Amino acid sequence: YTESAQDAKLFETVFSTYTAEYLKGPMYETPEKMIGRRPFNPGEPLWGEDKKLTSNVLGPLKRVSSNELAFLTMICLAIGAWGEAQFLWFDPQFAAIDRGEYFNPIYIIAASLLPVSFWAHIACYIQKANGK
Amino acid sequence: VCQNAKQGELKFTEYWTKPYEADALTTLFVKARVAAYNDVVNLFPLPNPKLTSGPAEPTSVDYDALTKEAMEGQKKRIEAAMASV
Amino acid sequence: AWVGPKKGSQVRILRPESYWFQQRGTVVNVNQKTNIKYPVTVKFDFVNYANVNTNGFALWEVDELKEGEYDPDL
Amino acid sequence: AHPKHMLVAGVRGYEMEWQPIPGDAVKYPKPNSEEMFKTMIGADVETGGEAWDPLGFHKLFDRNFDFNMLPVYPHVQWLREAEIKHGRVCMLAFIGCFAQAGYHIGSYPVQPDWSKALAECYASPTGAVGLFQISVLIGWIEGKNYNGDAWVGMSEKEPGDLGFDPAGFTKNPDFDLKKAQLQEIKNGRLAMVGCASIAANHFIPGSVPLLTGFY
Amino acid sequence: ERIPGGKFTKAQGKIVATPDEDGFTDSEVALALIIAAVVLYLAIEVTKSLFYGEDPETTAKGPMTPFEKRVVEKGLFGSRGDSYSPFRP
Amino acid sequence: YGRCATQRYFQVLGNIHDIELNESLNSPQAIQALSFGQLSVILLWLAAYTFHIGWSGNFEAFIDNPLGVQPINHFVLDPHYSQYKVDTTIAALTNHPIYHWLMTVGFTSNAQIYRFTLGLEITAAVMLVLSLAPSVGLLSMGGLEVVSWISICWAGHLVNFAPGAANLTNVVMEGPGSLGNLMNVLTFNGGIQLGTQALAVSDVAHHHVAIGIVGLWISALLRVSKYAWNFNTQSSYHLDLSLSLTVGGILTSLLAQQAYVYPALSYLPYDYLTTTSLYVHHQYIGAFLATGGFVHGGIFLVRDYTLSNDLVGKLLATKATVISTLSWITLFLGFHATGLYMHNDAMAAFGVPQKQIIIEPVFAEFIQQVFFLGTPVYGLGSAAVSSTPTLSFLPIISGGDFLVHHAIALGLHTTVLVLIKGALDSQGSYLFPDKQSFGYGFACDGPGRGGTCDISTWDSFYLAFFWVNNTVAWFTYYFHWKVLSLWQSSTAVFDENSLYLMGWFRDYLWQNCAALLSGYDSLGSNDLAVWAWAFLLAHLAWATGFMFLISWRGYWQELIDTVIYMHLKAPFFNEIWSADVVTPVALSIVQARFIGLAHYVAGFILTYLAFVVGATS
Amino acid sequence: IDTAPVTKMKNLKTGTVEVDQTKLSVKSWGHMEPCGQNKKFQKRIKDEAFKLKKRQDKYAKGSAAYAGVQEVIDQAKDTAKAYEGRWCGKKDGLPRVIATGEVTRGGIVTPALMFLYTTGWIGYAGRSYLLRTKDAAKEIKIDVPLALTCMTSAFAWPVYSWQDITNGRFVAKDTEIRVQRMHMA
Ligand code: CLA
Ligand code: CLA
Ligand code: CLA
Ligand code: CLA
Ligand code: KC1
Ligand SMILES: CC1=C(C#C/C(C)=C/C=C/C(C)=C/C=C/C=C(C)/C=C/C=C(C)/C=C/[C@@]23O[C@]2(C)C[C@@H](O)CC3(C)C)C(C)(C)C[C@H](O)C1
Ligand SMILES: CC1=C(/C=C/C(C)=C/C=C/C(C)=C/C=C/C=C(C)/C=C/C=C(C)/C=C/C2=C(C)CCCC2(C)C)C(C)(C)CCC1
C-alpha cells in the first residue's frame, strides 16, 4: 500500500510503547526485576501513581498507629533532650571524668534516643498521611 | 546515529561494547526495556527462587493473586497506551 | 494536500543530537513524498562544526512555530 | 518529544513538581504568583493604593519556570505567609522587649535586658525546661499549621489561618475580615520595623531617637 | 662512616648506629626464604588459576553450598546485584 | 605465531585488568580473588620492609635513643659503588615511619620484627589460598562490620602494648576496678602527649575501640535502612568502585592532615624528613584515589548507566549549568590568585613590599581561634585562654596562606571541572553527540567538524591528571615550606616571601636545593648523591613525557616505517627479520597520551621526592 | 633536637562555643595594629626612604634624574602618610586587606561594589549591543554609534537587569535554547 516513512515511524512508536508497557509485567523475567534490585517488594508497594509514600516504607512498624508513633517520638525527644542537656551543660559528664568518676549511664542512654525521635516523627507523619 | 542503544542498555549482551552492531529490533527492545524499568509502580517484583533444600516458606503474600492483578494491570496499561497513540 | 511545515516558516528542531537542537530555523522545502524519511529541509543562520547550515529533518523532528509565538532573541 | 521517564527539570515536557515532605503526594504547581498578587490583600494608601513590590520578589516564582523549572523561589502566597508570621512574632517580640524590662514571671534568671535573657534562660537548669516546653508547643502549633505548600501557591488556606479564633470574629455578619486582615498585616510590618529599630538601637546607640536609654 | 648531607642531619646530630651483630643470623633468613617459597608456589597456583580463568563447569556442575543457596535466594552479601563492594553495608 | 603488531602490547596492557572485558573471570568472585591477591602483594611488601628493617637495621638501637639515631631501611650492596662510596655508605637510611610505627605498636626487639615478617608471609599465603577458590561464600567476607571488627581487634592490640599496660589490673578477671585502672590503657587526653610528642597509645586504642563499636552500630543502622526502602537499582562495579575510591581519597587526605597535626607515632615529629614524606605521600595517594573515583564514575556513565529520572539523570540534564558554574569558579579563582600573586611580585620587585595586596585569611583565623586554639593568637572571634590546653602541631596562618589556599581551591575546582565535564560529556556533546557508543577511551573523531582531538572521556582524565599533580604540588609546596620555616624557626621569611611567587622560587626551591645538588661534584660524593642522581633521572623522565605528549603519532609512524625500511634493507638481517613478527608500529594516540602522562607524573613524583629528601635531610 | 612549635588547643569540654561579639572588629584583634605606630612598618618606610635617597645620590644635584628620584621620594612619603591609617599585622608591617565585610581602612566592601558596578556595566553594555545587533556583521563590524549608545546606557544595569530578571526578559526558557540533550533525555 506504499507504506509511508511516517507509517514506519508509527510502527516503531507502537512497538516501543507496547514493549515498555509489556516488560513491566511478569512476562519478561530479568535479573533487574528480582526482589531487592528494582521492584517494590511483592506485597509492599512503597508509593502509588502519585509519589506518596505508603505505610510499607516503615518496615517492621508498618502498622503502628500515628498516635503511637507521635507518642514514641515525643517521649524519645524529651528523654534525649534531657540526656543531652544533662551530659553537656547541666551536671557535665566530661567534667565528671575529670573528677575521676565514671560517666552516668542514664545520661548516655537517654541522649541516644534523639535520632530515634527524628526517624520516629518522620514515620509518624508517614502514618498520619496514610490514615493509620 | 544517536538512536543506537546505549552501552548500559546493552549490558551483558554481545553488543555491550559495540552498540552500533546491534539490530534495530534489539535496540528498540532495550530502549523500551529501560523505560519499563523506570515504572516501579507497575514493575513486577519477580519472586525469589526456591534454592534452599527445605520446605517452601509460607510467607504472607500470594504470588498468584499478584500475578493475576499484574496481568490485569498490563492489559489495562496496554489498552490505555494504544488509545493514546 | 501539503504535509509538513509551510515553506519559509520558522520551526524548532526536536532532534536531540542536531547541532541546532531546540533552536530555530527556516524551512526551505518539504519533500511531498511519503517514502522520504527526512523531507523537511531547514536552513539555519548558525553553521555547525562542519560549516553547513542546511539539513533535512523528519516530520516529527520539527515543531512549526507561529509568526509571533517564538522568541526573536533566540 | 522525550519519553515519560528521563523528564527532569529542564527537559521538554517536564511538568513542575513539588514534594518536599516524605509522605505527601506530589503537587504540580502552575505559575500563578502574579495572578494571585493582582487580587491580594494589602496595598493601602500609604504607598499610593498600589501593591508596593519593587525588586519584583512576588514574580520570582513565575521566573522559576524560566530558570530551571524548579521551586527555588517562593510563591507570593508563601511570601504573605512569611509576612504574617513575621508580623505576629514581631508584635509579640516588641511587647516582650518592653515587658521583660519591667516584669518578671518565672524562675528564670532576672535579666531585664532582652538581648541576654535568651542565653541566660538557656543556662538556667529551671529555664531550659521551660524553653524546651515553649519550643515543643511552638513546634506543635507550627507543624499542625505547616502551610509549606504555600511555597508553590497551593496552601488550601488563606495566609495566617491557624486554628485560632476564640472570639466571634470571622463568623459575625459584620466586622469585615478584609479590614481586620489589612490591619493585622500593617501592624505586623510596623512591629517588624519596631524590632529592627530596637536592634539598631542596641547595636548603634542613638539610631532611633526614642529608645536611647533602652537596652 | 658517612659524609653527612643536608642541614638537618648536621644540625640535629643524629648518628646512624650500626648494630654490632646482624639481627637475623642465617637460619631465620633461611626460614623466611622457605616460607616465601611456599608463598611463591601458592602465587604460581593463583596465577595459573586466574590466567586460564574460571572453568565453566565449576559454579555450574558443583552445587552451591546451602549458605550460598540461601544467600542467592535471599539476595545477600553482594548477590542480587552486579557489584563487588567489600564495604557493603 | 605472534603475527600481531607492537600496538597489541599497549592495547591489551591498557585493559589487561579490565576484567569486565575478560569474559573468563568476569564473575564478581574473580574480582574478590583479585582483591585477595592484591592484599597478598601488600602483605608481602610490608614483609619486605619489616624483614629488611629487622635484618640490617637499628631498631634495637632505635628504641633506646629514638631522637639520636637515624633509622636504617636496608643494607646497600651495589656492585657499582667505589670502595670509597662503599666505606662512605653505611646502609640505606629510612624515609618512612615504620620504625616509629613498630615502636608505637610495642615492638622492642628484632625477634618480634622477624616474627612479624613470618606472620606477614603466612598471611599473604592465606590471601593466596583464599584467591585460589573464588566463591559466593567468600563474597560474604567483608563489610563495614568486618572493618569495624578489625578496628576493635587493633584496639585490643594497642591496649595489650600500651606503655601503661604494665600498671593495668586485669579487667576481665579482677573486674573493671577504679577509673585510673582503665586509664592505664584507655584515655581521651586529646592531642600531643609531650615527650614522645605524639598521641598516647591509650588514646589510639580507645579511639579504635570506639570507632569499631560505632561502625558496628552504623552498619546495623544502614542494613535496617536497607530493610525498608530496599532498592539496588544501579549496581555496577564501577559505581561501587567510585564510591570506595572517593571515600578512600577523603580518608587518605584526612590521614595526611591529621597525622601531621596529630601524630600518632612516638617521636615522629622529631624526624622532619619522615613527617614531610608522610604528608606528601598520603596527599598524593588521596588525590589519586579521588581522581579514580571520578574516573570510575565516568566509566559507569559510559558503559553501565541507563538514563532515568534519578540523581544521575538530574545531574546529566543540567550538566551545562554544572560545567559553566565550575568554569566560572575556576576562572575567578585563577584570575584573582594569579593577579594578586603578580601584583605582589611587582611590588616586591619594585622595592615596595608594603603595597602588596595581602588579604588576611580572617575566616580561617576566626575558625582557628574560636574552635581550635586555646590561647589568643589572633584575637578575632574569641580571646579566651584555655586553663588546661592540649598540645598539637596546628600551624599558625598568615597573609600568604590566604593566597595559597585560594590556589588550592583553584586547583581542586579545576580538577573537578575537568573530571565532571568529561564524565557528563561521555553522554555526548554537540561536537560528539554519540559518545555513548564509542567507549570510555578512544583516539579522536578525526579532523572533521573542525577537529576532535582529546574528545574522549578518558582524555578528560588525561587532562585532569596534570591538574591533580599541579594541585598536589601547590599544597605540598605550601606544607613543605610552612614546616621548613617552622623547623628552621624563620616563620617570618615564609609569612612575608610567600606573598609573591619570586619568594616561592628563591626562598623555597632555589634555597632548598643547595644541599641536594652537592650530592656529588668534583670534590666527591656524599649520602645525597643518590638523590641528586634521582633528581636528574626524574627530570629526564619528565621530559620524555614531554616528548610523548607534544609530538603525536603520524610523525613517529612515518619515522618507524623508515626505520623498518632500514632494517629490511640491512645486510645479515633481512634473512632473519621480515617485520612480520610483532610488527613495529607507532604507539596509538591513546597509548601515547597515557605513556606521556605516565612519564610526566613519574618524573613529577620522583623529582619532588628527591627534593623533599634533599631539603629535609 | 626539637620539633615544630607546639600550639596549644582549647580543651573545650564545656559544651558551648563562645564567640566574643567585641572581637568582631579589626580594632579589637591582637595580631593587627594600625600602621601608624607599627614599628616594623615604620622601619620598612625608613628603609625605603634610605634606599631612595641612596639611589638619588648617584645623580648630581639639579639633574633631570635627580628631579625624577626626588619626585619618587615625595610620592613615597605621601604614600607612607596615607598608609599610616591602614592595618598592618604586628610582625610584618605590610598593610592588610580586611575582607570580613567591615567598612574599614583597606576594606573590601567599597572596592567590591565599585568593581561589581563597573563590570555589570561592561557586561550589560555588551549584552545590550548583542541584543540590538542580532547579526554577525554588526559583531565583526562594530556599529560605533549604537555600541557607544549601549555603553553609556548600561549605567542603569543594576536595576534594569533585576527588572528583566523578575519580568522574564533576562533569562531564557530552557526549552527555547540549545541545551545538551544528546543522551535523549
Ligand atoms: C521578611 C518579611 C516580609 C515579607 C516576606 C513580606 C512580604 C510581602 N510584602 Mg511586606 N513588609 C515588610 C516585611 C515583609 N513583607 C516590612 C517590615 C514592611 C514595612 C516597611 C513591609 C511593607 C510592605 C508594603 C507597604 C507592601 C508589602 C507587600 C508585600 C507583598 C509583596 C512584596 C514582596 O514580594 O516582598 C517579599 C520579599 C521580601 C519582603 C524580601 C525581604 C528581604 C529584604 C532584602 C530585607 C531588606 C530590609 C533590611 C533589613 C533593611 C530594613 C529596612 C527598615 C525599613 C526596616 C509580600 C506578601 C506589598 C503588598 O501587600 O502587596 C499586595 C505592599 O504593598 N510589604
Ligand atoms: C582499587 C582501585 C582501582 C581499581 C580496582 C581500578 C580498576 C580499573 N581501572 Mg582504574 N583508576 C584508579 C583506581 C582503580 N582502578 C585510580 C586511583 C585512577 C586515577 C589515577 C584510575 C584511573 C583509571 C583510568 C584512566 C582507566 C582505569 C581503568 C580501569 C580498568 C582497567 C584497568 C587496566 O587494565 O589498566 C591497565 C593498567 C596499567 C597499564 C598500569 C600502568 C602501569 C604503571 C603506569 C607503571 C608505571 C610505574 C613505574 C614502575 C614507575 C617507574 C619510575 C621510573 C623513574 C623508573 C579496571 C576496572 C581503565 C578503564 O576502565 O577503561 C575502560 C581506564 O581507562 N582506571
Ligand atoms: C601556567 C600554566 C597554566 C595556566 C595559567 C592555565 C590556566 C587555565 N587552565 Mg590550564 N592546563 C595547563 C597549564 C595551565 N593552565 C596544563 C599544562 C594542562 C595540561 C594539559 C592544563 C589543562 C587544563 C584543563 C583540562 C582545563 C584547564 C583550565 C584552565 C583555566 C582555569 C580557569 C582559570 O584559572 O582562569 C584563570 C586564568 C589564568 C590564570 C590565565 C592567565 C590570565 C592572566 C594573565 C592572569 C590575570 C592577570 C589580570 C588579573 C588580568 C588583567 C585584567 C585587565 C587589567 C586587563 C585557565 C585559563 C580549565 C578551563 O579552561 O576552565 C575554564 C580546564 O578545563 N587547563
Ligand atoms: C557581551 C559580552 C559578554 C557577556 C555579557 C558575558 C557574560 C558571561 N560570561 Mg563571558 N565571554 C565573553 C563575553 C561576554 N561574557 C567573551 C568575549 C569571551 C571570550 C574571552 C567570554 C568567555 C567566557 C568564559 C570562558 C566564561 C564566561 C562566563 C560568563 C558568565 C559569567 C560571567 C563571567 O565569568 O564573565 C567573565 C568574562 C570573561 C572571563 C571574559 C570577558 C572578556 C571581555 C571582557 C568581555 C567582552 C565584553 C564585550 C566585548 C563588550 C563590548 C560592548 C560593545 C560591543 C558595545 C556570564 C554569563 C563563564 C560562565 O559560563 O559562567 C557561568 C565562563 O566560564 N565567558
Ligand atoms: C496544670 C499543670 C501545669 C502546671 C501546674 C504548670 C506550672 C508551671 N509551668 Mg507549665 N505547662 C503546662 C502545665 C502546667 N504547668 C502545660 C499543659 C503546658 C503546655 C501548654 C505548659 C507550658 C509551660 C511552659 C511553656 C512553661 C511552663 C512553666 C511552668 C512553671 C514555672 C516554673 C518555674 O518558673 O519554676 C510552672 C509553675 C514555665 C517555666 O518557667 O518552666 C521553667 C515555662 O516556660 N509551663
Ligand atoms: C487574634 C485573636 C486574638 C488575639 C490576639 C492577640 C494576642 C493580639 C495581639 C496583638 C499585639 C500584641 C499587637 C502588638 C503590636 C505591636 C506593634 C505594632 C509594635 C510596634 C512597634 C513600633 C511601632 C515601634 C515604633 C518606634 O520605633 C519606631 C518605628 C521609631 C520611633 O520614632 C518610635 C518608636 C521607637 C516607638 C483574641 C482577641 C485573643 C481572640 C480572637 O478571636 C483572635
Ligand atoms: C562523575 C560522576 C559521578 C561521580 C561522582 C563523584 C566522584 C563524586 C564524589 C563526591 C565527593 C568526593 C564528595 C565529598 C564530599 C565531602 C564532604 C561533603 C565533606 C564535607 C565536610 C565539611 C563541609 C566540613 C568542613 C569543615 C571542616 C571539617 C574544618 C573547616 C571548617 C569546616 C566546617 C568548613 C557519578 C557516576 C557517581 C554520577 C555522575 C557524575
DSSP D154-211: --SS-SS--S---SSTTTSSSS-HHHHHHHHHHHHHHHHHHHHHHHHHHHSTTSSTT-
Q: Which of F95, F89, F74, F68 is nearest to F519 (CA)?
A: F89
Report the nearest atom of ligand 3 relative to the CA of F335: 36
Beta bridge partners of G8: F391
The alpha-carbon gap from A77 to the nearest alpha carbon of chain B, in Å, equals: 35
Interface chains of chain G (3 or more CB pairs under 8 Å): A, B, C, D, F
Dist. CA F295–CA F242, nearest whole Å: 7
Closest C-alpha among G183, G180, D2, C14 to residue F320 = G180
Q: Ligand 5: distance of its center to the CA of D108 in Å?
A: 12
D51 lines ligand 1 (CB under 6 A): yes
Question: Which protein residue has the closest C-alpha to ligand 2 atom 19?
Answer: F292
Tell me, what amino acid is at F498? S
Q: What is the DSSP string of C7-65?
A: TT-EEEE--TTSTTBT-EEEEEEE---TT-SS-EEEE-SS--TTS--EEEE-GGGEEE-
Sign of CA dihedral F233, F239, F241, F245: negative
Q: Using the structure block, give the residue that is written with the C-alpha cell 510596623.
A: D190
Q: Which residues of D lie closer than 8 Å to A, measured between beta carbons?
A: 17, 19, 21-26, 123, 125, 128, 132, 136
Q: Give residue F419 CA to ligand 7 midpoint distance, Å.
A: 14
Taking the C-alpha atoms of residue G75 and residue E20, their distance in angstroms, rounded to an integer, is 71
- Chain F residues touching residue D9 (CB < 8 angstroms): 314, 317-318
Identify whether the C-beta of residue F128 lies closer than 8 Å to the C-beta of residue E43. Answer: yes
Contact (CB<8Å) C17/G182:
yes
Identify which of F496, F493, F497, F515 has the alpha carbon closest to the alpha carbon of residue F505: F497
3-class state of residue F376 by DSSP: coil
Yes or no: say if A20 and B36 are a contact pair by the CB < 8 Å rule: yes
What separation in Å is there between the alpha carbon of D156 and the centre of ligand 6?
28
Judged on CB neighbours under 10 Å (0-12, 13-18, 19+), A131 is: exposed
Which residue has its alpha carbon closest to ligand 7 atom 28? F254
DSSP state, residue F329: H
How far, in Å, from the CA of F248 to the mean position of ligand 7?
12
Cα separation, F209 vs G164, in Å, equals 60
Of G58, D55, E39, C33, the closest CA to residue F129 belongs to E39
List chain D residues with CB under 8 Å of B34.
5
Name the residue at shortest CA distance from atom 31 of ligand 2. Answer: F18
Cα separation of D71 and D26, whole Å? 13
Q: Tell me the chain G residues in contact with residue D67 when contact means C-beta distances shorter than 8 Å.
A: 171
Tell which residue, F427, F178, F195, has the closest CA to residue F313: F427
Closest CA to D123 of A99, G18, A112: G18
Nearest bound ligand to the CA of residue G123 = 4
Place of cell 590566604: F402
Bridge partners of residue F391, in order along the sequence:
F192, G8
Which residues is C62 bridged to in the sheet? Answer: C13
- Backbone dihedral angles phi then psi of residue F192, each to the nearest 5 degrees: -60, 140
**Are G178 and C17 in contact (CB < 8 Å)?**
no
Q: What is the largest CA-CA distance in chain D?
A: 69
The set of protein residues with a Cβ atom below 6 angstroms from ligand 4 is F 324-325, 327-328, 331; G 122-123, 125-127, 129-130, 142, 147, 150-151
Is the distance from the beta carbon of residue F38 to the nearest atom of ligand 2 less than 6 Å? no
DSSP E strands, E26-86 = none
**End-to-end distance of chain D based on CA atoms, in angstroms?**
64
- Residue G36: CB atoms within 10 A of its CB come to 13
Cell triple for residue F516?
A: 641536594
Compute φ and ψ for F273, nearest 5 degrees.
Answer: -60, -45
Residues 2-21 of B with CB under 8 A from C: 2
User: A44 CB contacts (<8 Å, ≥6 apart)?
Assistant: A54, A56, A62
Name the residue type at position G9. M
Is A94's CB within 8 Å of G13's CB?
A: yes
What atom of ligand 4 comes closest to residue F335's alpha carbon? 39
Cα gap F105→F101, rounded to integer Å: 6
How many CA atoms lie within 13 Å of F592's alpha carbon, on the beta-carbon side? 20
Q: Which residues make beta-bridge pairs with F93? A: F72
> From the CA of C16, how many Å to the nearest CA of chain B?
8
CA distances (Å), origin G161, targets G85, G123, G128, G165, G169? 37, 11, 11, 6, 9
The gap from C-alpha D37 to its chain's centroid, in whole angstroms, comes to 17
Report the interhelical angle of G157-167 vs D60-67 (nearest 10°). Answer: 80
Q: How far is A40 from B40, CA to CA, in rounded Å?
A: 6
Taking the C-alpha atoms of residue F428 and residue B1, their distance in angstroms, rounded to an integer, is 12
> Chain E closest CA to B50's CA: distance in Å?
7
C-alpha D130 to ligand 5 mean position (Å): 7
| Nearest residue of A to residue D133, measured between CA atoms | A78
d(CA F424, CA F421): 5
Q: Does G177 touch chain D (CB under 8 A)?
A: no
8 A C-beta contact, residue F591 and residue F492: no
Instruction: List CB contacts of G157: < 8 A, sequence separation 6 or more.
Output: G117, G120, G121, G123, G124, G125
Beta bridge partners of F542: none
Structure resolution, Å: 2.9
CA D67, CA D41: separation in Å to the nearest integer? 28
Q: In one letter, which amino acid is G57?
A: D
| Phi, psi at E76, each rounded to 5° | -125, 165
Length in residues, chain E: 89
CA nearest to C71, candidates G52, G178, E41: G178
Q: What are phi and psi of C27, to 5 degrees?
A: -75, 125
Q: Which three cell numbers stand for residue G72?
A: 619618587
CB proximity B10 to F under 8 Å: no
Rounded to whole angstroms, how far apart are CA atoms E72 and F28? Answer: 13
Distance separating alpha carbons of residues D128 and A53, to the nearest angstrom: 36
Instruction: Check contact B-E (3+ Cβ pairs < 8 Å).
Output: yes
State how far the Cα of D19 lies from the Cα of D16, in Å rounded to an integer. Answer: 10
Counting other chains too, the contacts that F581-586 makes at CB distance below 8 Å and 24 or more residues apart are F581/F2, F581/F3, F582/F2, F582/F4, F582/F5, F582/F6, F582/F8, F583/F4, F583/F5, F583/F6, F584/F5, F584/F6, F584/F560, F585/F5, F585/F6, F585/F7, F585/F557, F585/F560, F586/F553, F586/F554, F586/F556, F586/F557, F586/F559, F586/F560
- Between strands C10-13 and C24-30, the pairing is antiparallel
Flag whether G touches F (3+ CB pairs, 8 A cutoff). Answer: yes
Whether chain G lies against chain C with 3 or more Cβ pairs closer than 8 A is: yes
* Chain position carrying cell 521551660: D130
Residue that is written with C-alpha cell 580571646 in the block? F383
Radius of gyration of chain C (CA): 12
Pairs of residues, one from chain A and one from chain G, whose beta carbons lie less than 8 Å apart: 13
For residue F410, how far is its CA from the centre of ligand 3 (angstroms)? 10
Q: Given CB atoms, is G8 within the 8 Å cutoff of chain A?
A: no
Burial per residue of F388-409, b for 16 or more beta-carbon CB atoms within 10 angstroms, e otherwise: ebbbbbbbbbbbbbbbbbbbbb
Question: In this structure, are residues F111 and F279 in contact, taking their beta carbons and an 8 Å threshold?
Answer: no
Residues 6+ apart with CB under 8 A from D143: none
Chains F/A: 3 or more C-beta pairs closer than 8 A?
A: yes
Whose alpha carbon is nearest atom 32 of ligand 7?
F367
- Report in angstroms the alpha-carbon separations of G56 from F571, G49, G74: 77, 10, 12
Could you please report the per-residue DSSP string of F194-237?
SSS-S--HHHHHHHHHHHHHHHHHHHHHHHHHHHSS-------H
Three-state secondary structure readout of chain A: CCCCHHHHHHHHHHHHHHHHHHHCCCCCCCHHHCCCCCCCCCCCCCECCCCCECHHHHHHHCCCCHHHHHHHHHHHHHHHHHHHHHHHCCCCHHHHHHCCCCCCHHHHHHHCCHHHHHHHHHHHHHHHHCCC
Cross-chain Cβ contact F68/E3 below 8 Å = no
HEC profile for D10-62?
CCCCCCCCECCCCCCCCECCCCCCHHHHHCCCCCCHHHCCCCCCHHHHHHHHH
Q: Amino acid identity of F328?
A: W
* Alpha carbon of F246 to ligand 7 centroid (Å): 8
Which residue among D147, D151, D189, D192 has the greatest number of ligand 1 atoms within 8 angstroms of its CB, and so is best to mutate? D189
- Distance between CA atoms of D152 and D146, rounded to whole angstroms? 14
Helices (H), B1-85: 24-37, 63-84
Residue B26's DSSP bridge partners are: none
Residue G157 CA to residue D106 CA, distance in Å, equals 56
Angle at F35 between CA F33 and CA F39, to 5 degrees: 115
How many degrees, rounded to 5, is the angle at CA C5 between CA B85 and CA C9?
140
Whether the Cβ atoms of residue B81 and residue A21 lie closer than 8 Å to each other: yes
Tracing cell 578518558 back to the chain, one arrives at: F458
Q: How far apart are CA F152 and CA F82, in angstroms?
A: 51
Looking at residue F73, the DSSP 8-state letter turns out to be E
How far, in Å, is the centroid of ligand 4 from the Cα of C47? 21
Which is it for strands F390-392 and F358-359: parallel, antiparallel or unpaired? unpaired
CB contact under 8 A, G8 and F433: no
8 Å CB contact between F268 and F97: yes
In terms of residues, how long is chain F? Answer: 617
d(CA C71, CA C54): 21
- Report the residue of F309, F318, F324 to disrupt the D interface, i.e. the one with the largest count of D CBs within 10 Å: F309
State which residue of chain A sits closest to B27, comparing Cα positions. A16
**A112 and A82 in contact (C-beta within 8 Å)?**
no
Residues in Cβ contact with G43 at an 8 Å cutoff, skipping those fewer than 6 apart: G93
Mutate which of F330, F420, F601 to test ligand 3's pocket (most atoms within 8 Å of Cβ)? F330
What is the rounded distance in angstroms from the CA atom of residue F435 to the CA atom of residue B6?
9
Q: What is the DSSP letter of B57?
A: P
Residue B8 to residue B4: CA distance in whole angstroms: 12
Task: Tell me which residue has cell 542546511.
Answer: C54
- Say yes or no: B61 contacts chain C, CB-CB below 8 A: no
Q: How many residues are listed for chain C in this entry? A: 74
First-last CA distance in chain C = 32
Contacts of B46 (CB under 8 A, 6+ apart): A26, A29, A30, A33, A34, A35, A39
Q: DSSP label at F313?
A: H
Q: How far is the CA of C68 from the centre of ligand 4 (A)?
A: 30
Query: What are F55's three cell numbers?
Result: 635484618
- Give the SS3 label for residue G130: helix
Which residues on A lie below 8 Å from D23 (Cβ)? 52-53, 122, 125-126, 128-130
- Residue F370 gets which letter from DSSP? I
User: What are the strands, taking DSSP E only, across G19-177?
Assistant: 96-97
Which residue's CA is minimally distant from atom 39 of ligand 7?
F312
